Structures are given as structure tokens and as C-alpha cells.
Amino acid sequence: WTVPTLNPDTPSPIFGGSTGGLLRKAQTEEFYVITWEAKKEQIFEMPTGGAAIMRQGPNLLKFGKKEQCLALTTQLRNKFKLTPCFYRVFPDGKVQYLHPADGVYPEKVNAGRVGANQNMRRIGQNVNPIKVKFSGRMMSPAEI
């Protein structure tokens, strides 16, 4: 498996434009780019409002936050059975692949993944707050 490379010269779905598009954050902080492969032309619903028409083949779109890209990904997977993927793009031109992280969707187990933020105990086995008091900052009893 290999990490995909963002192609900026990728056709985009035919949309007339809306007011729920990108804002100054896309030029000052970061934005997201969702790409997918469509087998045929089809009218889909935009996460920011309106109905667009996805073209046959590659399709690229820009969104303000990751939630919009994952919402469109879920819509394309559950309504048209596609395989979309998205990146986070910075104003300096840096592209960072986000989902799927390993090329395999996270609902199914995949080899090579390492569990993080996992507590090898239960909720009732957590310590009292008095034991985590007077720390460097506000620490919850579940953070340890």
C-alpha cells in the first residue's frame, strides 16, 4: 500500500456555488480536500447545502473542516458504494493524508495498527480525584 498524492488538476463536480463554501480560514489556517472515483455521473447532496453532480472518474472538492469531508465520505459510501479519501491542506502547500489512515477503513480491524489511549482497566477501577489533585494542571482521574 502507498500513500496517495494529491492531484490539483483533478476535475470537480458541477456545482453552481453556494455561500456555505470556504472562508478566510482556508487561506489563513488550513482546509480539507476530498477526492473520490465515481463510476458514472450522479446528482449528490453537498454537505454545505445544494445539489451537485459528480462526474465520471476522479472528483475533487474543498471543505472548511474535516467533519464536512467525512460526512460527504459517509454519504458517498452508503448511498453510491464508493471509496473516497481526504487530505488536510495548509496555506504553504503542505498536503497531509488523513482518512483512511492505513488505506483500510477503521471499522474493520487491520494488521499493523497500535492501540492508543487505551486503559487496561474499567471505569469503576479509576482513582479518586484527591489522588490526582495538585498536579501540573487540571488532570482527570482517567488521564492516568
Binding site: I123, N126, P129, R137, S140, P141, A142
Partner: protein
């Protein structure tokens, strides 16, 4: 990027939205939640905060003294304290037109002034102030004391002056010094002032710093004190024809226990107050030698706590380990202190209206109403704070392993039973009080007032008869002349006390009937429901069946999400939040009852209250509608008078209350979506997008929304009732 504010939280400083400012302002006093906080530093920060608060209190007192000496009419009010209204301070408002200037020009002043309702005139006149020079000297002295306290607060934070952690935990030494020094010596000094200054000034003799070292407070001059013949100090007291401030009919005694009230001022005797302060000073000083600090003798609070477990095992481990869980928990100490302070504040309100201590205070009806309402609302807020800090103690400082089997753990052991019984009491009281009120209302509406249920409060009337009131006719204890309890006080204090309690012209144990019984049940309902909400929130703060891990989320958090059916207002902070409304409602009922009963007493028609206090229509029409006619008439198309400021304050409080309803009903999501639309509008507008924000605009958080709505609700409530109370009492009298 990361901002400098706040400096105590790097996480809040990294927040790029408007939430950073609000959260930094609301978490500045949460010393335990800062970055890099230890126990010693925590105590030092609280010490500095205590000094700063003391400085603020003293500076505020000095400001009041200064304004009364400058713009007040204290020199003229002392000559005629019955027909002259006190002046708070002058008014300099460029917005006032000519009618406002002549309307507020009252009280013998030369310009627009505010008539005070705080009662500082009567208090200062009673303690000895006669001229404006005394008030000026007191203001200067208090300002210098406040400056010294501020300097002390700054000095104690610097190195070589910061106290150690063990110094802050010296409970035995601190309690011995507060019982013997801050309580006993202070009371003894007040006794010295009353005997040396207040008592001679009330008899027409000016005693000040220039002549108190040569004027003898008693003709025998300290001889009966050293010879043990203290009974000579009570000889020749003030007669029944004594005039306050003059020597006409003035006695020579300094420590008596005549009881009752002064015939002219209708207030407590100064000699009795001095004797009281002396006795409590002796008691507090003696009580100051109970704990062992550095001389071997004394006690240890840990030993007394650990040696108080019943042998039957009814209390489990008893009070074992209570010394460590209290000395190491600041929230427990703060909760205990706030509970005692709130109870004492309520005690102050009741004792001051019933037993007037300051001269010519009973005739000032506005002063009585405002003072009682002020102290009762402050006490309610303080009580809610005590329970809130108790919940904070359970979440942050409770240790089940250290408190195993003691009374504290047993509280959480049967918390369901406590909440259930509180629920039953509140339900019973609410159903019965509301049912009796609606029944009386229907009977009054159907034209049959004899069919309404009027239960006579025989228990409280029986207590009043025990105190000496013969109106009911029980004739026992102090009411029967052949009783030992009655014959044992006839030579010390019972004559004046009986003469004052049997007089129906004062507020000393007023006559009660069915209306008083019903409103008392309403008061009990409010107290029990507020206690139910607070107790349930404090016991369920560490967890319940809905949230088994609520202790791991802190004292205040929004919710646990919409899962499990919904978890809105699940934190202990939310329980306090819902309890503030019940506290305001309870204090509203007690203040409504006090204001109506005293208004009908001052108007000379107590039958109006006795006949209209049994049905809610009487409360709504004869009290709220009848007493607001002059208030809402402060400004109208025909002109205005001095009562227009209270009308504006009335509408001001109504507006603030209604504004709080917005934050209370409408929730975050709608506002955040609206804000997003406004963000797009500003970003796509020419000649205006050049001015961009430094903080990303976001909607207020759920907790912040609850606090903002509660603050508006309380402010509007307080301002509305204060304006109505002062306007109605001032216009009527």
C-alpha cells in the same frame, strides 16, 4: 497563537475564540485549577486574597462615612431624628433636567441628593457620632487601615514573609487566638467604647479623644470592679423620662440588664448592650483556652474527634479521621463557615427587626424593610454557597479510603433515603399549602369566606404565651404570675421585657393567625425544597446510576451528551443552579410576608393582613397591586417626582429578568449557527472585512449560559423587589 491572558492556564490561553476571555475571567479565583499549583502556594494566594477583601471592605466603609460627613445632613438629623430624612450623598447627573433637579432636592439640602435607606445614621448616632468631624476622622482612620491591609497583602506574598504550609494548618492555635483575641478582646474593646463614649454621649456629655483620659465613666472610678462589688455599677439607671442625647432624666449606671426598649427611641438600652458585650467577652476569652498549642495544657481536636464513637456501632466508626479530612480540605472549612455565616445573617435580620438596637430605628420603616430584605437575601445566597462548596468537597477532596466507616461515609451510604424523605416532605408541604390556598381562594371567589380552612397556629402562639404574651390566654411560664420562672426575673429583667412584648405597637413577637400559619408553611416548603436540591446535588455529585463516574468529570461540566436518554443538567453545578431559583423564591416569600405584615402594622390596620393573607388573591391585589400605585407613578405625562428613579429601577429589573429568560430558554446551537452566518456576512462585506477579529466569535458555552441567565435572573429579581419595597414604604410614609 498563544495569548498572555490567562497566565494561570496555558490551555485556556491557547483557545483562539471568545470563550478564552469568558473562561479566564470566570476561573481566576479557582486557585486549585491553575497551572503549577501546590498546597503552600494555594494557601498563600488565599491569604493575599483575604487581605485584599479586608482592604476593600474597610475602604467602602470609609467611603460611606466620608460621603455622610460631606453631602449628608448628620449634624441636622441628630437634632430631629423623627421628622428629618437622612441623606446618602449628592447627585451630579448632567442628564437631569430642571424638574429632576427640583424633584430630588429634598431633605434640607441645596441640591439633588439621595435619601439613604441603609440605616447608618441611626447606628452612628447610637454609638456616639454627633458631629461631621467625627465621621471625617473615622473615614480617614478606616482609609488608612484599608491601606495598611493592602500593603500587608502585598508584603505577605514576597519572600521572607510568606507563611509556611504548617503554619496555615495550626488549627489549635488559630482557633484559640480567634476565640480569645478576635472575639473576646474585640468584644471587650467594644464594651470599653460603649461605657467610655456611647453611654456618656447619649447622656449629653461629649467625650472624645481630647477629653476621655480625664472624664470618669462612673462616679466610683474602677473601685467596685476591683473590690468585687459589681452591683454598684447597675445603680441609678436611666429613668423612663430620659431624652436621648441630653441629660434630662439620665442615670449614672454603665452596666444594667433592665431589658425591653427605651421609651423614646424604641431601641435597646445602651447599658444593657455594654453589659452584654462584657459578658460575651468574658465567655469568649475563657473559651479561648481550650486547645493545646505550646504549653502542654489544653486539648487536641483530633483526640476529641476520635474519642466520640458510640459503643453500639450506630454511627459506625464515629468521627474517626474527621480531623484529617477537614484540616486538609479547604472546601469543607469554607462550606462550614458559609453555613454558619448564613444562619447568623438570618439571625441578625430577625433580631434586628424584632429587637431594634439603634436609636430611632423603629420609626424608620424604609430602613427596617430594606435592612431585613438585604440580610435575608444575602443569607440565602451564602447558604446556597455553603451547599455548593460541600458538593465541591465531595468531588475534589473526599477520600473514601481515609473516611472508612465514619459519619461522612455513612452520609453517602444512605443518601437515597435522605433524598427520598426530603422529597416526601417537600411534596407534602407543597400539596397542602397550595391546596389550602386554592381552597381559600375559591371560597373567597364564591362569596363564602367562612367556608375557607383557617388553622390556628396554636404551637407558635403557645410559645409566645410562654414568653410572656397574655393575648392568647395560656397563662403559663412567664405568662402566669405565680410561676417560679416569672418570679425569678421580676427583679432583674422581666418588667421591661414583659412591657415590651405585651405592647402591640412594636415588632417584638407580633400577633399571628391563620395567614401567618399558612405563609410559615410556605416558608417551610421553600426551605425543604431548596435543601432537597442542594443535598441531592451534593450527595449525587460523585456519581449515581445515570453517571457512575461523575466524580471524574469535576464539579462543573456541560453534560454527558444525549446518550442514555439525555443527561442535561447532570453535574452538581447544575443542581446548585436549579437551587438558586428556589432560594430566590423562598426569600421572596419571606420578604413578602415581612413587608406586608409590617406595612399593615405601620398603617394601623393589621386586620387587613389577617383577613387577606389566607388567599392568594389578597396577596396579589391588596399587597402587590395596592402598594405599587405610587411606584409606577414616579414619571408620567403629567410630570415626575423624586419617586421616578424607583420606577425606572422597577422597569430595569423587569428587563434584566426577561433578558435572563433568553439565556435560560434558548440554548447554544441556534446561536452558534446564527453566529456562523454573521461571520460569513462580515467576511464577505467590502469596506468592513479589512477590520478582522482577533478572537474567533463563538456562542456562549452551556455552563456560561446557565451562569449568565442565573445572574440576570437574580439581578432583575433583587433590583425589582428593592425598588418596589423602598418606593412603597417611602411613599406611604
Amino acid at each position: 497563537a498563544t495569548k498572555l491572558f490567562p497566565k494561570f492556564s496555558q490551555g485556556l490561553a491557547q483557545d483562539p475564540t471568545t470563550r478564552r476571555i469568558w473562561y479566564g475571567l470566570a476561573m481566576a479565583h479557582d486557585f486549585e485549577s491553575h497551572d503549577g499549583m501546590t498546597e503552600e502556594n494555594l494557601y498563600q494566594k488565599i491569604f493575599a486574597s483575604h487581605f485584599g477583601q479586608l482592604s476593600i471592605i474597610f475602604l467602602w466603609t470609609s467611603g460611606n462615612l466620608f460621603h455622610v460627613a460631606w453631602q449628608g445632613n448628620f449634624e441636622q438629623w441628630v437634632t430631629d431624628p423623627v421628622h428629618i430624612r437622612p441623606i446618602a450623598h449628592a447627585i451630579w447627573d448632567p442628564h437631569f433636567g430642571q424638574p429632576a433637579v427640583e424633584a430630588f432636592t429634598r431633605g434640607g439640602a441645596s441640591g439633588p441628593v439621595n435619601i439613604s435607606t441603609s440605616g447608618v445614621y441611626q447606628w452612628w448616632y447610637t454609638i456616639g457620632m454627633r458631629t461631621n468631624q467625627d465621621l471625617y476622622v473615622g473615614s480617614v482612620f478606616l482609609a488608612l487601615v484599608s491601606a495598611i491591609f493592602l500593603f500587608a497583602g502585598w508584603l505577605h506574598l514576597q519572600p521572607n514573609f510568606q507563611p509556611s504550609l504548617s503554619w496555615f494548618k495550626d488549627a489549635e492555635s488559630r482557633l484559640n487566638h480567634h476565640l480569645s483575641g478576635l472575639f473576646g478582646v474585640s468584644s471587650l474593646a467594644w464594651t470599653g467604647h460603649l461605657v467610655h463614649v456611647a453611654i456618656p454621649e447619649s447622656r449629653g456629655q461629649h467625650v472624645g479623644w481630647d477629653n476621655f483620659l480625664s472624664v470618669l465613666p462612673h462616679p466610683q472610678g474602677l473601685t467596685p470592679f476591683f473590690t468585687g462589688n459589681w452591683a454598684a455599677y447597675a445603680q441609678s439607671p436611666d429613668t423612663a423620662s430620659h431624652v436621648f442625647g441630653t441629660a434630662q432624666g439620665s442615670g449614672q449606671a454603665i452596666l444594667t440588664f433592665l431589658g425591653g426598649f427605651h421609651p423614646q427611641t424604641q431601641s435597646l438600652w445602651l447599658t444593657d448592650m455594654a453589659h452584654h458585650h462584657l459578658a460575651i467577652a468574658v465567655i469568649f476569652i475563657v473559651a479561648g483556652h481550650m486547645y493545646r498549642t505550646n504549653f502542654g495544657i489544653g486539648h487536641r481536636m483530633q483526640a476529641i474527634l476520635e474519642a466520640h464513637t458510640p459503643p453500639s456501632g450506630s454511627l459506625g466508626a464515629g468521627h474517626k479521621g474527621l480531623f484529617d479530612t477537614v484540616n486538609n480540605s479547604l472546601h469543607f472549612q469554607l462550606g462550614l463557615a458559609l453555613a454558619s455565616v448564613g444562619t447568623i445573617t438570618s439571625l441578625v435580620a430577625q433580631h434586628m427587626y424584632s429587637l431594634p438596637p439603634y436609636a430611632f430605628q423603629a420609626i424608620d420603616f424604609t430602613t427596617q424593610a430594606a435592612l431585613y430584605t438585604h440580610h435575608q437575601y444575602i443569607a440565602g445566597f451564602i447558604m446556597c454557597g455553603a451547599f455548593a462548596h460541600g458538593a465541591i468537597f465531595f468531588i475534589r477532596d473526599y477520600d473514601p479510603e481515609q473516611n472508612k466507616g465514619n459519619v461522612l461515609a455513612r452520609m453517602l451510604d444512605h443518601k437515597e433515603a435522605l433524598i427520598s424523605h426530603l422529597s416526601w416532605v417537600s411534596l407534602f408541604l407543597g400539596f397542602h399549602t397550595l391546596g389550602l390556598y386554592v381552597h381559600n381562594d375559591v371560597m373567597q371567589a364564591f362569596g363564602t369566606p367562612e367556608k375557607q380552612i383557617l388553622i390556628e397556629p396554636v404551637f407558635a402562639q403557645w410559645i409566645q404565651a410562654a414568653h410572656g404574651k397574655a393575648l392568647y390566654g395560656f397563662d403559663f411560664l412567664l405568662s402566669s404570675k405565680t410561676s417560679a420562672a416569672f418570679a425569678n426575673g421580676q427583679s432583674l429583667w422581666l418588667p421591661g421585657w414583659l412591657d415590651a412584648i405585651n405592647n402591640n405597637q412594636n415588632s417584638l413577637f407580633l400577633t399571628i393567625g391563620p395567614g401567618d400559619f399558612l405563609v410559615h408553611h410556605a416558608i417551610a416548603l421553600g426551605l425543604h425544597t431548596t435543601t432537597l436540591i442542594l443535598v441531592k446535588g451534593a450527595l449525587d455529585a460523585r456519581g449515581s446510576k445515570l453517571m457512575p463516574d461523575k466524580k471524574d468529570f469535576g464539579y462543573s461540566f456541560p453534560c454527558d451528551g444525549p446518550g442514555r436518554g439525555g443527561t442535561c443538567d447532570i453535574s452538581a453545578y447544575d443542581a446548585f443552579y436549579l437551587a438558586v431559583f428556589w432560594m430566590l423564591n423562598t426569600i421572596g416569600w419571606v420578604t413578602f410576608y415581612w413587608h406586608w405584615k409590617h406595612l399593615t402594622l405601620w398603617q394601623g390596620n393589621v386586620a387587613q393582613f389577617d383577613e387577606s393573607s389566607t388567599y392568594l388573591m389578597g396577596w396579589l391585589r391588596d399587597y402587590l397591586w395596592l402598594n405599587s400605585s405610587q411606584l409606577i407613578n414616579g414619571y408620567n405625562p403629567f410630570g415626575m417626582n423624586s419617586l421616578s428613579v424607583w420606577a425606572w429601577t422597577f422597569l430595569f429589573g423587569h428587563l434584566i429578568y426577561a433578558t435572563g429568560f433568553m439565556f435560560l430558554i434558548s440554548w447554544r446551537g441556534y446561536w452558534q449557527e446564527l453566529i456562523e452566518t454573521l461571520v460569513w456576512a462580515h467576511e464577505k462585506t467590502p469596506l468592513a472585512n479589512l477590520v478582522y477579529w482577533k478572537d474567533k466569535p463563538v456562542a456562549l458555552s452551556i455552563v456560561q449560559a446557565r451562569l449568565v441567565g442565573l445572574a440576570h435572573f437574580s439581578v432583575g429579581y433583587i433590583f425589582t423587589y428593592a425598588a418596589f419595597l423602598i418606593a412603597s414604604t417611602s411613599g406611604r410614609f
